[PDB]
Design a protein around this ligand. Sequence first.
Ligand SMILES: OC[C@H]1O[C@H](O[C@H]2[C@H](O)[C@@H](O)[C@H](O)O[C@@H]2CO)[C@H](O)[C@@H](O)[C@@H]1O
Ligand SMILES: OC[C@H]1O[C@H](O[C@H]2[C@H](O)[C@@H](O)[C@H](O)O[C@@H]2CO)[C@H](O)[C@@H](O)[C@@H]1O
Ligand SMILES: OC[C@H]1O[C@H](O[C@H]2[C@H](O)[C@@H](O)[C@H](O)O[C@@H]2CO)[C@H](O)[C@@H](O)[C@@H]1O
Ligand SMILES: OC[C@H]1O[C@H](O[C@H]2[C@H](O)[C@@H](O)[C@H](O)O[C@@H]2CO)[C@H](O)[C@@H](O)[C@@H]1O
Ligand SMILES: OC[C@H]1O[C@H](O[C@H]2[C@H](O)[C@@H](O)[C@H](O)O[C@@H]2CO)[C@H](O)[C@@H](O)[C@@H]1O
Ligand SMILES: OC[C@H]1O[C@H](O[C@H]2[C@H](O)[C@@H](O)[C@H](O)O[C@@H]2CO)[C@H](O)[C@@H](O)[C@@H]1O
Ligand SMILES: [Mg+2]
Lengths: 421, 421, 421
Amino acid sequence: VDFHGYARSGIGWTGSGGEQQCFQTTGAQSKYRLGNECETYAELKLGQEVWKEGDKSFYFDTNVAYSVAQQNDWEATDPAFREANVQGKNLIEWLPGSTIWAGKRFYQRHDVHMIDFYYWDISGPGAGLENIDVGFGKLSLAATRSSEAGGSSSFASNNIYDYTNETANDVFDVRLAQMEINPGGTLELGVDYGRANLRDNYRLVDGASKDGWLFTAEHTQSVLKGFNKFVVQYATDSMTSQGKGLSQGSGVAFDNEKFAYNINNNGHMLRILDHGAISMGDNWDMMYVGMYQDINWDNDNGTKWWTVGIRPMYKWTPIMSTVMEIGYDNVESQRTGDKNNQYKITLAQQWQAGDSIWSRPAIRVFATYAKWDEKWGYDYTGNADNNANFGKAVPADFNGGSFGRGDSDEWTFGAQMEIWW
Amino acid sequence: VDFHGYARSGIGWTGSGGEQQCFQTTGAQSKYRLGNECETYAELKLGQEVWKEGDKSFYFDTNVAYSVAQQNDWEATDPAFREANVQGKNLIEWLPGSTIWAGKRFYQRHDVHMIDFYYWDISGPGAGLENIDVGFGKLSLAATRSSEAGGSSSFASNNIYDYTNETANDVFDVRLAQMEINPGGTLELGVDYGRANLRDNYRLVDGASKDGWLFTAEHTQSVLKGFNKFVVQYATDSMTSQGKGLSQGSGVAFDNEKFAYNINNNGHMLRILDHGAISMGDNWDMMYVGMYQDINWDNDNGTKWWTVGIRPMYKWTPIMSTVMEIGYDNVESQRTGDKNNQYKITLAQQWQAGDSIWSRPAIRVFATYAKWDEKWGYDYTGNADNNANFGKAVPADFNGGSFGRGDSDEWTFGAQMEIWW
Amino acid sequence: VDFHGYARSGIGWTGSGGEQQCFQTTGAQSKYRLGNECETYAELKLGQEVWKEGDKSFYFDTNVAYSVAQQNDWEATDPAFREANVQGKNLIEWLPGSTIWAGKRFYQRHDVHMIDFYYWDISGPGAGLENIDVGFGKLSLAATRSSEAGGSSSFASNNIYDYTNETANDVFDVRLAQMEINPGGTLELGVDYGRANLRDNYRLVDGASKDGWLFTAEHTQSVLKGFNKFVVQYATDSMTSQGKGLSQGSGVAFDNEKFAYNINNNGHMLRILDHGAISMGDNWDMMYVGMYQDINWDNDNGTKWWTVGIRPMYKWTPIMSTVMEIGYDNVESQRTGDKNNQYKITLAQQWQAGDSIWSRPAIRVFATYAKWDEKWGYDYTGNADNNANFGKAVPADFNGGSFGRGDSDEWTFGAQMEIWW
Ligand SMILES: OC[C@H]1O[C@H](O[C@H]2[C@H](O)[C@@H](O)[C@H](O)O[C@@H]2CO)[C@H](O)[C@@H](O)[C@@H]1O
Ligand SMILES: OC[C@H]1O[C@H](O[C@H]2[C@H](O)[C@@H](O)[C@H](O)O[C@@H]2CO)[C@H](O)[C@@H](O)[C@@H]1O
Ligand SMILES: OC[C@H]1O[C@H](O[C@H]2[C@H](O)[C@@H](O)[C@H](O)O[C@@H]2CO)[C@H](O)[C@@H](O)[C@@H]1O
Ligand SMILES: OC[C@H]1O[C@H](O[C@H]2[C@H](O)[C@@H](O)[C@H](O)O[C@@H]2CO)[C@H](O)[C@@H](O)[C@@H]1O
Ligand SMILES: OC[C@H]1O[C@H](O[C@H]2[C@H](O)[C@@H](O)[C@H](O)O[C@@H]2CO)[C@H](O)[C@@H](O)[C@@H]1O
Ligand SMILES: OC[C@H]1O[C@H](O[C@H]2[C@H](O)[C@@H](O)[C@H](O)O[C@@H]2CO)[C@H](O)[C@@H](O)[C@@H]1O
Ligand SMILES: [Mg+2]
């Protein structure tokens, strides 16, 4: 049996008091992780090559995930069964080297490690024909699925509270990779077409986006004994809310009191990213990110996000280093034009199983400092019924109350382990 | 560590719209599975032979099951801890080859694969002395347990709503197998005696069945490089509701509003089954079922069910085939004499790790078509309190409303993987 | 992958009727286990040495626990993710042989097997520097965490119902072990300092204990081919309620109707224990316990507990024995001076993978008999709001009602397996 997975777990303290707190900018879709993770998260994978005959094999893979608060020993939880799929390679003679798979699977996900941000992730139940040799590159075809909690009406209503039926969304993905646009550089190109798939006779709210597109172009350049990826993505309508390849075409959300509300996503998103990891000399490693994300919605409630951070690692020994992370976020409300921003600085002393900034397990002892100034927040007071500004960007002091995190500081510290195996 | 289990997972679509739907006849205790399974189900077993000295060993086995809807990637769930037992073989000198076991265990279950129907399954917490050589055959002894959600009263009441205490049921099983009644044929004989086991001073509703019997006779005949099993079972009272070897002697059920209601099972059941799998030549494999099940209750709410289906497999290659399944159901209401019936036809193109119809993993790409006509359904409208016909068979149009699935059609299609390892 | 764990599972019956019942004295913090365990409990550990270079290694360990009632086969549950940690040995040159760990971990827990009582257990999320060679012994340093369900107020209130915020408690542990005070005898010394760690601006109820100490001294003496441990512990205030090394400094509890109530623990605890396991000859093994525990609270609601039991094992064969357990409990109410007492006697026939009383797997077939006489119980009638004596020791017949288990008997019997691997 092959045993694989991912896990992080630790203990932490907040400078001003209590358990460790973590810091993410309001409106930002991520935070800089080092010394800024507040849960024990673990994926336990048990797979196995179950049959092989020459070139041909069938591989079976599973994945059970756990997320607990790490405030006690006995912490009961609901594990998520995330993967259960079978991959058959070289089963099709006419398309050599290609794999046919079916089942629940984490499919070719692209992410930026230091911000734990996935930018191209259509995982879920699915099926596909993978790595077909097109000569100049490899072509992959996949269909995966997701579903919104409500959004469909059994009959025609004008009342949004009637659209409570779960709505399936399908994604049809096509990728063409490993094309050497240049020396030390490859180009991947993807097209995602997602759409809400209604049961016979159901209906979506009038004006719901229904479908959309995600277009991706990723260029990888081998550099400084590392790499640099430069990404450009553009989404349309139903693909703009999740923004990673999954569709949300009903445009309906629910308050905690089960009230439906209209979160319509007609609009577009433009993401331009550049991240990588480079070694410089023998004593230095560094990962870096720079991103600009603009979600422009018809309804005016989008955001324009900018991030940058770097994570230099200095190796004292082949197994001991000092890692440092500095991250900066700035998010502007499409609705109000206000701006939330933050900068985090973490300093850690670590021990890792390797000499790379990618080496795991790592055991860290850190101190983090964050200072923010948020001038807007989302209005989640009231009910989708009470509140009519429910879920909308609103200034920090709107109507005497207060939104966003304010303008303060905080420092935390602790020890943590992270590992993938 | 030995890693074993079962898992199926896929993606599907309904002809008329939305996620894949599955089709089972109202009153039928099963459906024909091919291209008719709508969940990701998986059992992950980790066991190990923990001690061995010569002929003697102790084996430890566990089983954790997961069932998710397969509509999203992150699907939190409550796994079922189904097995945790220790089997000690050859530990008793005077009864060589026999095993003593204790713990939660899937014990010698008999099922019909294509309809995923278990007809002899007394699994659960238990203990036993297994495979004792009686000379002409092997004798097995086991005691297992189950419990109904309510059914017991702490005191005497005339009000069914008072019988809300969980009621333990015990099964005492004796089997005598591997007797060669003939050439290429064996005979197994079993006797199950189940009974509700009340706490000191509790009582069951007046007239509750309390106990019952299940008698099984299974004949296996080696044929056409395969087998054919012919089964005949007869149950009495408390064993008729579950109908697989477990007892439900309280005769009390609960509506979703926590209302107790009387589901009394005094009566009997007669099951006559014949299934098998035969290879015919080199290019053909086929499994088949034919069953007649009559649950005749004193309360008149039983059913008389008839099924038949076949699943021919034609091998193009040793790893690629075309499988087809055709199934037919017909259930008649004991209470109303009406009839529900259905026929399903599925066509699949598969790739399996082997040349058998029993070879797994299998990766299928299918299309299913079902056409039904249901003339009765169960009344689950109202409350066990509001409704007094609650849970009873009622005609399709009863009192202007509508019961059963109607008279329609539907086709689905998709890809799926199934595997046992 | 290393597969390890613990599991017990069985089937049982109560003499007077129904599923097996188990017997523990009111006020006692444990029961004598043999033939007195009523659940299927299992810990499945999957770990692995992930990197090794010479003397240095990184080990990764996990632990997922399950507890089900064992009354049915399908029993859905919420597993507890109890361990996910990484241990790095010999990573620090100046402190050879020492381990640095971080993550959730069962840390050096001390327990008495026959009563399944842990007396020194600070496990949970944590981090530490383990086994530092101090020359005359090994020094260990650890910081772990726990948190109470409520206990903190966002603002100052005089109303206990306002203290509903979860309150983190930190433990700082220092141990010095393996000192040979004598021949065949070692001495371990520990100091635990626990404290409630409030968020900036939160407050604890007026008079809440806040912090406390646990002092441990354990002497192990190699004897009769076995050992004998003699323990003496003394706790103060916040460490007296849990009494194993974890802190509960808020002093606030909640009724099932979510009502806060004051369970203040200022006071002290004195525990004096002696347990061991000795072999006597070739045909006899025996474990034994004797303990006196005095929890003296300022609020007068403590207890003075005395236990003693022995578990002789007589080996007929190297794999078959007859085990017997006799246990006695006596608990006196600090508040009322009344006394609850019980004696249990179990007789079992077992088969184990080994000739020791510590050999597992063990498959038992037993009969247990318990006879008790309880003259007090805790008042949990009403609400923390209705009842003002809620949670207090009260005589058996207090105000006409009845508290405690009474004065009766009962016998049970069944089969069970227990195993650690
Ligand atoms: O497995 C390789 C990747 O491991 C991590 O990815 C984790 C991520 O950190 C965690 O927060 C997420 O929930 O699960 C994935 C594992 O599936 C790193 O973050 C990635 O950079 C690595 O490539
Ligand atoms: O998918 C990778 C991410 O997995 C986790 O995130 C979970 C989260 O823990 C869960 O509560 C939420 O409902 O779903 C997400 C996955 O969609 C990890 O926490 C992250 O580190 C990973 O990025
Ligand atoms: O493990 C051998 C059997 O595998 C399957 O049995 C599954 C069944 O398909 C699934 O629906 C049920 O819930 O669990 C069992 C595994 O315990 C096949 O259906 C059987 O025909 C095989 O003999
Ligand atoms: O026991 C074999 C069957 O196991 C599963 O069925 C579960 C079902 O998933 C669960 O929701 C229900 O409560 O219990 C049954 C088992 O009693 C599989 O779904 C089936 O394929 C198997 O036949
Ligand atoms: O693993 C060695 C110890 O196994 C058991 O400890 C169990 C205990 O029995 C169980 O009730 C508890 O919940 O979990 C632990 C396993 O972590 C024995 O009780 C101990 O005496 C053994 O040393
Ligand atoms: O920690 C060892 C003990 O683990 C279990 O006890 C659990 C119990 O099952 C769970 O319901 C409760 O909430 O937490 C405790 C652990 O704190 C075993 O049941 C025991 O045998 C062990 O002593
Ligand atoms: Mg749950």
